[PDB]
């Protein structure tokens, strides 16, 4: 559990469709060191191949973050933005936003009068539209929650964009530590998941895997959750059960966990998605999919919080599944 | 001086707890040039700059609005209460700097996919554990610092009120030349909870002239043209009932003399400023208010213009030096 | 002393009318032990227990919340207005004790203060006036002292008579002390801490302690109340509270092994201590309270042990304090 590597994976620039701004390069480099080959497709997916014989498996964690984009700039240099993904305007009050302009990274704050959009005006220190632009701002400039990593103690930490950068980091770590494996493995850092799981769809079509595992984050029990949330922090990684989940693959997961003595949580999901596993399962002739998740609290806010112990068991389980996988009958 | 200014701003010290950090900063910074410095039973820092007449009191509160822990639940979450004008709205998905037994520790307010339901996560899984970490009923916290200089002039950061005026005042104090007036510079406490500190300090000082250096609203989005002051246009000084006319005309003169740009804003009512209790203190005092305009007051993103802070300091010392006995009787 | 206690609790005296009964009781009982006892122009009772230093003022308000008669209608019913924090909610189907020139007269509210009509058994305005009723006649919750058991009891006007009793009992049992003590029974607290303000100005103490009642955990409080009945006196922490004085209190309570609860009072308290702290040049203040349930109603209920432990701590604190720096 590398904290520095974890943090930079978490804070590397890369909103949906702009993953090339920083995160993609990190993923490629860290993967090229252990993979037999690493490519980047038309949409920006990073596909690392770890040669094996069978079965052919695809594991994916998205690299994109939710964020905002400048719709226009007014005469007084203020910015009017729109969301990129599931951005809660409630989480944009009295918050700092990291924008990526021509002249590099520039900050802006969303004030409050001493909620719906365009009631959301960003202040960037300008006095006119002309001045804002001269600062590098333009129609289409994108922004992200300002980074802020908070280590609360031994285990727990809070920060923007644990979704899905914490699962990305877990996948990458398991891949760096992968041992012997007869499965033909493809580790994918997908793009545009926050806006339609469009990255995993394109990559699963190119890869055409038999087995597919999406590593995403999931809700953890928290205040005012009214008891509807099953998973709990510190209780280990989570693996769904439901229509989107292949029983043979999921049953194999239990065993691996049992064998390596890794705590594993079960989470109801009577539908699919928003993981990449949704579009992976209906890819071409059909894929046996499963979901491996890290539970976090306060999803989609500047304070998503996780427990390093879960991250750890996710890395172990991910690795153990990959090495334990061999030819099987996935037909339900 | 961005270094010193940020220090004054982020120094600990919520209403009633100014001794956690801000109090010492202020004292030290002033012992350098002040003839005497002391602190009363409430924590007011009072610096004396001996002069003949008139006796003038200038104040800027050192207290920040913040929160306090009401209780810790079984799962280790904190339930807080507001100290000062804290809006539940500025507490969602935000970080809180708490001052526990074991030192400064952080917590975060959560959310889901009126204070009662403002629960703070500090990373504990039990009450015993939260306590183990140094959290006690009564523990206080403040917005987490995050100083952001937007450009050459503008910057945004929590607790611009009233630390920016406190800076400005301290700075003008350090740069004070010759003055005929007997000057008292006060770092007031508990101003956010009822101008309680200024009351006491002014009763002890008993000045003929008093000036409050606080922050005011600047034109910003959705203000509906109701706010007069504008960032970048200089320090502001009110006009109205609790603003002594003679004193205010004077400042108008000193301003134009030193050519400092000066904004004017109406205040038809005695304001939530220390100059409120200063004027009605003892037999009455000729009072005026000198403010730095800021946007988004009482939030983590209050923003100001350095050029305004600059002129406020210029005007501050100029007034303090040009001040000579005169009649303030309206 | 349940008898002295019930008597301090039931003694007449709403805000501004403390002279109707409680004042003289407070005066009489304090005169027996204090070195001097005086009544200022606003009605505050100020008892001095001469000492060296620091000079300390301790206050508990003698006033009660209540009602006043606005006018009498043709049919002899009274129309009242509240004196203090009285809510018509607590007036339905309740008996009210009025004070007329003819003496104590009772009235009942049957089954927004424009719907609160008091019936006194009169048939006409003239008969009501003949019974002793006038515009300005004041009234209180009828006394009704219920001992539930060995420790708990319920009664109107535990606020703030219970703390008044405690302070008085502590003063009567006071032993050797170095501080220059001033025990005050303040007036008009329920309408602006008016009494304590003037009293502190005169005394000009260096230290000040307010003894009031505070909320105790009770049904439907949804976990928002810290203090509980039976777990001892309570001492606030916050801006209105001087850290060093509070620290001192802690050590005293520990030294005597007196249970002491803590309560977060984030804002300037609604007690005499509020005005004591900003009095003249400033004062190191703190708050000592007895927790009670159902505040401001006819059934305010408390626990005897807490009352007792409050007297102990109050006594101990006064005998134990001495000159020390209170500068935060």
What is the name of the CATH class of the largest domain in chain A? Alpha Beta
SSE string of chain A? HHEEEEEEEEHEEEHEHEEHEHEEH
Strand content of chain A: 25-35%
CATH superfamily of the largest domain in chain A: Zn peptidases
Provide the spatial order of strands within the biggest beta sheet of chain A.
Answer: 1-2-12-3-13-16-14-15
GO molecular function (chain B): aminopeptidase activity; metal ion binding
InterPro entries (chain B): lys_aminopep_Arch (IPR054931), Peptidase_M42 (IPR008007), Peptidase_M42_aminopept (IPR051464), Peptidase_M42_dom2 (IPR023367)
Protein name (chain B): 354aa long hypothetical operon protein Frv
Cofactor (chain B): a divalent metal cation
Describe the structure.
The structure is cut from a larger assembly and holds three copies of chain A. The first copy, chain A, is α+β, with helices and mostly antiparallel strands and 332 residues long. Chain A has two domains: 251 residues, Aminopeptidase (3-Layer(aba) Sandwich), CATH 3.40.630; 81 residues, Peptidase M42, domain 2 (Elongation Factor Tu (Ef-tu), domain 3, Beta Barrel). Chain A is built from eight helices and 17 strands. Chain A has an eight-stranded mixed β-sheet, sandwiched between helices. In chain A, strands 4-5-8-7-6-9 form a six-stranded antiparallel barrel. Chain A has a three-stranded antiparallel β-sheet with strand order 10-11-17. Chain A starts with a helix and ends in an 8-residue tail after the last helix. The interface between A and B is large, with 48 and 47 residues. Chain B: Belongs to the peptidase M42 family.
